[PDB]
């Protein structure tokens, strides 16, 4: 059985290839005291320790913290040898080339992985959507990537990198808490404010529209129980945490919303291609799986291109795990057991192996 | 003749870890050649010192081919430029110039008529194309692969054939001419690196990276047998030969061994281990004649000893990365050329034989800015790992020898009578006396470039930025500034004192050679105007009368010192590159070397 | 990429099919992956002759929750000239399993970079995709293209 | 005392006549809300306005916005009153004749200046290097232009035009500085990383054996003070964000680089003219301001020249502003005082008399 | 263009020295008016045909300074002997920016004034206008086989 | 917003200052290189202070140091604005610009302080065209003459007032 990791920006989502579902999907972060603790025991140990993002924007930053996951996604999470199963990763898109060698010298290396295998993740939600020329909006954690790809092969020069996503959103949603009166700062805190957001939180189709409605009703307050039992009530705030995709502004930020950054990556390809791009966009990662998101993303793409062109927002209602589902298809597959880089092709070949068996 | 070619030290094949190096040879037998960086590289088989460059591709060249009439060379680079180029007349004159497919050419073809040319590789809406030489028209369609074409090869029998091997884990096979898919064949599990049909055309062998060698016959591509049973190596094999009887297979593996086999009984007849490191990989093999040749993945050349498997009978070695530095040295009663290029090797050649080594242990890590030798026979080089490194020149061997740490990279070094040494850092001058840091300039107030000690070993010139020399004087283990300022064009590139101390000829970058006469004075004495790049190198001749300079321009001009209005103008030394550093074997020799890895010695006439 | 190897009998239909007795040539055909899922092998009683609107009859043909490759030798008539260019095109219906779908889409450049020298690419997503007809004549020659498969548009 | 006015697709530089220097160098961007604000006053605004340029490659685009720069740049920043000092203006390459006319319009009009004269950007360069055959790779912010000149008459049908210019190079900078994981992403820090560029940024002479020595190499590495206080530290990006002017392919572009532009506008002129061409190349420019790249140009054009042909890369220490010098010279001169067309010339003839003075 | 006007001297220089002993000059130099406005010849810098020329000629010509010449260039070839005008415009990099610039854009004028001239030789440092491969070129195309007598 | 309205006089000055117009020499010597304005008698108005101010033509030949006398020129004890004509040079160009000076010492009474940065916002709008302001709190953060140089282009800055730094 081989072994399928996400590396995303927040969470990390491992499983086995042939599943339908990742098994263990843990945040990605490495804790140290004000030894070092790895993944929901950073989160699960009290304010006494600083919590540090290996990827925190789809690129790695720190290898070091970066071995720690893996190690604890190996052994505490699927609680497996890696020296016995195959593992393929997906790397976020314009991954710097050295990046992709040290992957692959540390999965041969440090963990003895008998195969490995790289993929991108944005072209993995494309095919998972049964489609291969589009653009695909994978909204994570902690980066929103435009990936504008065209015959399975993504344009480096019009991928689109935007620093909104979940983390910012949860942020702005303890921000935004604390004006009804609850108090949300600490870590266990954050948790809950997560999951609010994820349980309570829609994009509204109109904006204004649907704020003078908040404001002239209690037909959107929703309540929410909290652990210890106490039962919060949520009005707007619902409405107004996922609107800062559309509208950064809102947390301060110079960038576009994801709207227009999708526009403007379509802008910046062929004209022949455009018509293909606009009618397949492709939406992926957690974030996008507000309800209501698309049918706002549709509206928005079509004020902002011509009014000639048709605008089709593909939404799959397994788009949050796509990124992971279609590569535990792909490494399920009787055919994919010749594209692993095997490790005996490693050490003859050295970490450039990767840029000819893979990419 | 002004100058004439006497000599060329070819540069070794350019080699990369994992990547098939392919090797052609001619039908007449006479020179195998390979590719390096933009040069192609003819080598003599019988005697390598022997050898001959061709630089007119713009981009890397990655194959090239000898036609089956031997007049014509097909060299194809990574820009999909195909070129064919005579070979009878030392120019060189270009014949046709075709584009196939925009994107890396990876084999070339010919058919045995020698007017139809197959090019494969990996281009952006095809991976090969079969074409008429002359008129560059497709005479066929190159089909069923899916990924990049490594190797391609046909027949040269009637009827002929045509087989691609690529990255797609197959092989196609074609019959022609017209060209036409006839099948492929999937027996392979990995890439499929080279595909070899038979001189007599009677088999044909696809070799891959899965360690299995397939003989399949030459007419018909159905399979005849799997070399070596269950396997033929212990790794991926990168490149095999056929024996010109057509009998024997040479492979050649990246397990680190090569091998003969009896294709007719499937036995192997030899096995020739090559070492035991990542670098003694074979990544190319030819069988020309009774010369067995297998390429390391140091790019060293191997001639495969049959009778000593484990000895070679020749280890043809050099530089595959651009030289950067170049002197001389005559030990006894020979002169010994020393090179040193951007890798931190360095190699010394025979001047007469051209017979070429390198010194045993491990040296410089990286790029050796400058090397010199010194008057109790050791060479001092200054390398770019913030180290100069004093070796024997009579054991030859990096260890045991003498090391010293800089905390600034160096940049230049000279050396002088009295074990004193002057070292030009970043911002800084260093004095090293008997292999010991003894002085330092730190901040000098001007940005040092080069050095030159006078042979007399009490004054040094320093060059700086500004485009002023500055003299110093050696005194105890201090330097002292004598407060004199020469005046150059323009930032100082490169200071060299006469053999007899008698004059100091100061090169700059605004394509001016100011020669000072340091007996009156250190007055200017004459300036030399000419080039019309910026200059780089410059040597003084043994006769004390002449002086060559090599610049930017791509040029190469020897002057007379008495008289500035003659001149010896070599151009293009070293094609499409800037010669990189020179010197003088004796008052009639000029070696220079370049960035293309190879020395060349040039009889200099007035 | 999913690693599936291309049947040499799709190879050599596109090569038929490409050059250009008349009774017998194939408008249309449909490719599928094996029992096995291992081969693009060719549909036995999935196919046109152009001796037999034939785009209604072919699209009709492609399965209503299946990925299907496809092969059409659409003509067609500009107001410069008359042309006739094989399209290939990638029947994707949203209706159909997720394995299938992921399976067809990755393996399809495995196919359409065996048959070099085609240029026209069809993504049919859904059934309203490829029955429009102004799309594949936008896909053929845009604005330029006046009347496709004989009739005007 | 005249005016010279040169515009450029990213800096305005104005200045006085017989000044060795333009006294101001300003941002030609107009910004507008999310009342109007010009040049830097829209840097030190940033995320409030969006910013757009009217001269994005050279020619005129947004013929009202250019008003108004043209304005700031008389009363802000020469301060002086445009209506008592003689203008003279620089025009891109192939400018269309209609924005010839529009200009000295706007100028006469607008402005009421006394006098007006337009030249063109490359031949100023070309005889402030005191040559009047010759090409030149004039490489700006957002567009390089190679003008082949003979005999003072830029040849039309050979003037090629590259979009890769010092913009792509400061967006390669910032997009490989988030390797290092440092974030850059704003307005404000796009004019640090801008800084960083103009600093530290170096041509070399062979791109792979440049790689392959930094490595190991102490010198390298490089530190850069932010104006917050905090240091960056950039290594082998020094020389990789300017390689993209000679390999396109970095940023994902297929266009030739500036030596391949250089070499086939030569190959477009007559064959008894490209031995002037190739002796007699001039570059001018900001972005030809990298140290070093003299010598590459020289070895990239020497290998797509033919075999027996003199190659003359000409880089003046003054080429970063060689354009506006040039026009400094000019409008000082006492006998160029006939040349200026006098607001009368205008009256009489109207918009076309720049087609008659001006050349 | 700087819009300096050419002096009726140069121009009759030229004119008379176009049409075909010693009182004839082989070669001259023009320079610029003190006033900045003039094309002027200036006193010492001339070449009689009376009186190796070209090797006098480039020493006349100032080291940190432009001016423009006017030399009758000789060349001989296989087919014939053939005698013509040559353009010179010196600007060496060493000169101060205003002389190249003011030089440099007042060139077409008097070039233009000069009507029936062919040749133009742009030499801009010491090393373009001392060589006689150059000038030989400009004058024959891939036929001179010596220039001014001395053998190529 | 204090609501405290900016004179016709100081708008004048400001005008004339900024642009600069053809003029006679004797007339460009009265040309204002600094110039101070204070709250009125009724805190009403921003008018401009009589005697506090520095002319072109003083610079060279009775003033030595334009700076250093217009640093003298502020009180100590009061809140003022300034109009500093800074005529500096970087590395690429030689530059003259306006800076807007807000003086306001901690020694200062609370009531003035107040109101002059509660007005600042108006007069510093009303003042089109002005992009370096020098916020001044105390003697040591105004007398040096680095400040200044830092506030104009930073570190670019090699010369001021025709002095090195
Ligand atoms: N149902 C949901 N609705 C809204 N947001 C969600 C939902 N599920 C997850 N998220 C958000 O998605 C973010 C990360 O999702 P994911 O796409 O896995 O990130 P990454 O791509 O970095 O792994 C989390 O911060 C979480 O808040
Ligand atoms: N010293 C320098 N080194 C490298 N690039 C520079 C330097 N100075 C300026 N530049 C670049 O030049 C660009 C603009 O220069 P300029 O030629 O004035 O453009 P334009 O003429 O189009 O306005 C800027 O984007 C800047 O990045
Ligand atoms: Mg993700
Ligand atoms: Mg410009």
Redesign the interface.
Same mark, same amino acid.
């Given at each position: 059985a081989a072994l399928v990791v996400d590396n995303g920006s927040g969470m990390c989502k491992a499983g086995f290839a042939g599943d339908d579902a990742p098994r263990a999907v843990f945040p990605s972060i490495v804790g140290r005291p004000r030894d070092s603790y790895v993944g929901d025991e950073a989160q699960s140990k009290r304010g006494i320790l600083t919590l540090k993002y290996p990827i925190? $924007?789809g #690129?790695v /930053?720190?290898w070091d913290d970066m071995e720690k996951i893996w190690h604890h996604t190996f052994y505490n999470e699927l609680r497996v040898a890696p020296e016995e199963h195959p593992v393929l990763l997906t790397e976020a898109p314009?991954n710097?080339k050295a990046?992709r060698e040290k992957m692959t010298q540390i999965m041969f290396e440090t963990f003895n992985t008998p195969a490995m295998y790289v993929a991108i993740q944005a072209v993995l939600s494309?095919? %998972? @959507?049964?489609?291969? /020329?589009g653009i695909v909006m994978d909204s994570g954690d902690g980066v929103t990537h435009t990936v504008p790809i065209y015959?399975?092969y993504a344009?480096? $020069? %019009?991928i689109l990198?935007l620093?909104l996503a979940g983390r910012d959103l949860t942020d702005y949603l303890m921000k935004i808490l604390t004006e009804r009166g609850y108090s949300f700062t600490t870590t266990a805190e954050r948790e809950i404010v997560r999951d609010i957001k994820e349980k309570l939180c829609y994009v509204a189709l109109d904006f204004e529209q649907e704020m003078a409605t908040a404001a002239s009703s209690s037909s959107l307050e929703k309540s929410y129980e909290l652990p210890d039992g106490q039962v919060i009530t949520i009005g707007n705030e619902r409405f107004r945490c996922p609107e800062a995709l559309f509208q950064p *502004?809102f947390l301060?930020? =110079? *960038?576009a919303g994801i709207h227009e950054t999708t526009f403007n990556s379509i802008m910046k390809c062929d004209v022949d291609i455009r018509?293909?791009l606009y009618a397949?966009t492709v939406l992926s990662g957690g974030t996008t799986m507000y309800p209501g998101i698309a049918d706002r993303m549709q509206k928005e793409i079509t004020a902002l291109a011509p009014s000639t062109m048709k605008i089709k927002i593909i939404a799959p209602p =397994?788009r949050k795990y796509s990124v992971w #589902?279609?590569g535990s298809?792909?490494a399920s597959? *009787? /055919?994919?057991?010749?594209?692993w880089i095997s490790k005996? =092709?490693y050490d =003859? @070949?050295?970490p *450039?192996?990767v840029h000819?068996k893979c990419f | 003749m002004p100058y004439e070619i006497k000599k060329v030290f070819a540069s070794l094949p350019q080699v990369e870890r994992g990547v098939s190096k392919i090797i052609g040879g001619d039908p007449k037998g006479n020179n195998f050649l390979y590719t390096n960086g933009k040069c192609v590289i003819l080598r003599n088989i019988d005697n390598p010192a022997l050898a001959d460059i061709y630089t007119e591709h713009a981009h890397q060249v990655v194959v090239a081919k000898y036609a089956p009439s031997g007049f014509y060379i097909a060299s194809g680079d990574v820009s999909g430029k195909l070129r064919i180029w005579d070979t009878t007349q030392k120019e060189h004159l270009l014949k046709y110039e075709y584009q196939p497919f925009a994107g890396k050419i990876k084999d070339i073809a010919w058919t045995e008529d020698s007017k139809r040319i197959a090019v494969v590789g990996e281009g952006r809406e095809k991976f090969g194309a079969v074409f008429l030489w002359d008129s560059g028209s497709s005479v066929g369609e190159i089909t069923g692969h899916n990924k990049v074409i490594n190797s391609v090869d046909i027949k040269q029998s009637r009827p002929y054939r045509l087989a691609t091997g690529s990255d797609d884990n197959c092989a196609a096979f074609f019959e022609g001419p017209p060209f036409k898919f006839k099948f492929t064949i999937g027996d392979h599990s990995r890439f499929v690196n080279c595909v070899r049909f038979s001189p007599d055309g009677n088999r044909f062998a696809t070799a891959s990276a899965d360690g299995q060698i397939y003989i399949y016959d030459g007419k018909t591509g159905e399979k005849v047998c799997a070399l070596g049973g269950s396997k033929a190596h212990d790794g991926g094999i990168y490149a095999i030969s056929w024996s010109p009887d057509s009998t024997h297979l040479l492979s050649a593996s990246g397990d680190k061994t090569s091998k003969i086999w009896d294709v007719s009984v499937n036995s192997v007849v030899s096995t020739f281990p090559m070492g035991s490191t990542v670098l003694d990989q074979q990544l190319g093999c030819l069988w020309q004649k009774d010369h067995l040749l297998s390429v390391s993945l140091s790019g060293y050349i191997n001639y495969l000893d049959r009778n000593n498997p484990s000895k070679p009978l020749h280890v043809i070695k050099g530089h595959s990365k651009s030289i950067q530095c170049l002197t001389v040295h005559k030990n006894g009663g020979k002169s010994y050329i020393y090179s040193g290029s951007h890798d931190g090797h360095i190699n010394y050649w025979d001047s007469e034989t051209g017979e070429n080594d390198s010194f045993a242990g491990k040296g410089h890590t990286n790029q050796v800015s400058r090397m010199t030798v010194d008057e109790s026979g050791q060479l001092i080089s200054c390398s770019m790992d913030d180290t100069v490194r004093y070796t024997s020149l009579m054991l030859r061997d990096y260890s045991g020898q003498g090391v010293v740490k800089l905390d600034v990279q160096p940049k230049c070094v000279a050396v002088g009578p009295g074990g004193y040494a002057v070292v030009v850092c970043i911002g800084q001058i260093v004095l090293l006396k008997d292999q010991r840091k003894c002085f330092s300039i730190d901040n000098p107030g001007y940005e040092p470039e080069v050095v030159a000690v006078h042979p007399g070993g009490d004054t040094v010139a320093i060059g700086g930025v500004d485009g002023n020399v500055r003299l110093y004087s050696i005194l105890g283990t201090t330097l002292k500034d004598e407060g004199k300022l020469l005046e150059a064009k323009g930032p100082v590139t490169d200071v060299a004192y006469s053999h007899d101390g008698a004059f100091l000829a100061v090169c700059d970058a605004s394509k001016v050679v100011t020669v000072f006469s340091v007996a009156d004075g250190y007055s200017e004495n004459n300036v030399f105007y000419g080039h019309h790049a910026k200059i780089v190198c410059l040597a003084w001749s043994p006769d004390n009368e002449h002086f060559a300079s090599g610049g930017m321009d791509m040029m190469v001009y020897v002057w007379t010192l008495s008289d500035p209005e003659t001149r010896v103008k070599i151009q293009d030394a070293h094609r499409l590159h800037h010669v990189s550093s020179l010197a003088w074997l004796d008052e009639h020799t000029l070696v220079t070397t370049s960035h293309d890895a190879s020395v060349k010695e040039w009889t200099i006439t007035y | 990429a999913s690693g599936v190897a291309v049947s040499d009998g799709v190879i050599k239909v596109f090569n038929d099919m490409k050059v250009r007795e008349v009774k017998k040539r194939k408008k249309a055909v449909l490719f599928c992956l094996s029992e096995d899922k291992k081969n693009i092998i060719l549909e036995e009683g999935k196919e046109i002759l152009v001796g037999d609107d034939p785009y209604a009859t072919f699209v009709k043909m492609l399965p209503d929750k299946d990925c299907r490759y496809a092969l059409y030798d659409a003509t067609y008539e500009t107001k410069e000239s008359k042309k006739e260019d094989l399209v290939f095109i990638f029947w994707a219906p949203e209706s159909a399993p997720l394995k299938s779908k992921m399976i067809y889409a990755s393996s399809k450049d495995a196919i359409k970079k065996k048959l070099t020298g085609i240029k026209h690419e069809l993504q049919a997503n859904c059934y309203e995709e490829v029955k429009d007809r102004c799309t594949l004549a936008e896909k053929l020659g845009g604005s330029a293209v006046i009347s496709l498969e004989g009739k005007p548009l």
């Open positions: 925190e $924007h #690129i /930053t720190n314009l710097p990046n494309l095919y %998972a @959507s049964g489609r291969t /020329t015959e399975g344009l480096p $020069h %019009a990198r620093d *502004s301060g930020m =110079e *960038s018509k293909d397949n =397994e #589902i279609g298809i792909l597959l *009787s /055919t994919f057991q010749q594209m005996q =092709e =003859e @070949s050295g *450039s192996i000819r | - | -």
